[PDB]
Amino acid sequence: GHNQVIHQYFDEKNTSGVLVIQTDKKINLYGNALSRANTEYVPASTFKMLNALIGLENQKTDINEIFKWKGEKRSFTAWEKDMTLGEAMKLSAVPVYQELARRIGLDLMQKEVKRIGFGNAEIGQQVDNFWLVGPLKVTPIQEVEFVSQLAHTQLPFSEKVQANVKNMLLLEESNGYKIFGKTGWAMDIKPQVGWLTGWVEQPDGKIVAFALNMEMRSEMPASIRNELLMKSLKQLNII
Ligand SMILES: [Cl-]
Ligand SMILES: [Cl-]
Ligand SMILES: [Cl-]
Ligand SMILES: [Cl-]
Numbered sequence: 436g437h438n439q440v441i442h443q444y445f446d447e448k449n450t451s452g453v454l455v456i457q458t459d460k461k462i463n464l465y466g467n468a469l470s471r472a473n474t475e476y477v478p479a480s481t482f483k484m485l486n487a488l489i490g491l492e493n494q495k496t497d498i499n500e501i502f503k504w505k506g507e508k509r510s511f512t513a514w515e516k517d518m519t520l521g522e523a524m525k526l527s528a529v530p531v532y533q534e535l536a537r538r539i540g541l542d543l544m545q546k547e548v549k550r551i552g553f554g555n556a557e558i559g560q561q562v563d564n565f566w567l568v569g570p571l572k573v574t575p576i577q578e579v580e581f582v583s584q585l586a587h588t589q590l591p592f593s594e595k596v597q598a599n600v601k602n603m604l605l606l607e608e609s610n611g612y613k614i615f616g617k618t619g620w621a622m623d624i625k626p627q628v629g630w631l632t633g634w635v636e637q638p639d640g641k642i643v644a645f646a647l648n649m650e651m652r653s654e655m656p657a658s659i660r661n662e663l664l665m666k667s668l669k670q671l672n673i674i
């Protein structure tokens with residue numbers, strides 16, 4: 436349950452980051468830059484959790500809808516295919532979620548973001564990028580609470596919608612343990628910010644929420660978010 440080791444982990448990967456842990460409304464901070472936890476960063480793709488919630492609750496889409504790829508080149512070849520909301524969730528396929536955001540529209544999206552009170556709750560005028568380059572910003576502490584509420588089905592949306600989004604977030608399942616989460620990586624801002632937000636469902640159903648937030652660099656493999664999370668959750672004996 437320390438705290439200096441976990442500091443060494445961040446130290447070793449030459450990054451600046453924080454790991455926010457929330458266990459039944461008790462919050463703990465870890466990593467090598469704890470002041471990040473109350474610092475506002477753009478959510479990047481972590482916002483997909485909320486985008487989906489808003490989209491499903493307002494019936495702009497459903498979990499079965501197949502989003503058609505219409506041929507434009509995308510940032511990743513893995514994105515160039517028809518997919519569902521859930522598939523797009525697993526791949527962080529931005530263009531699908533931008534299509535969703537456009538269906539929702541600026542009015543509906545702004546209203547929802549403030550009703551939920553997400554981060555600074557400002558989305559500006561472009562409904563299809565506000566979470567990648569601003570103006571929307573959120574603290575890693577705000578994210579762990581958000582995701583904690585989602586895990587407990589406590590967000591101001593219908594339970595079926597929350598359960599549908601939770602089902603899209605399963606990352607690993609081993610030894611009676613479940614890890615749910617969403618990565619983010621805002622590459623077009625400086626400094627770059629990487630996220631891994633989610634929760635652990637322990638074999639007895641106890642839920643432990645986490646929000647990893649770290650400064651990123653282009654040379655980094657994306658899986659560095661996963662490694663820094665996974666070895667920390669092991670140190671704290673959460674898995
Ligand atoms: Cl602490
Ligand atoms: Cl520190
Ligand atoms: Cl079906
Ligand atoms: Cl591109």
Ligand SMILES: [K+]
Binds near residue numbers: 442446467
């Ligand atoms: K250090």
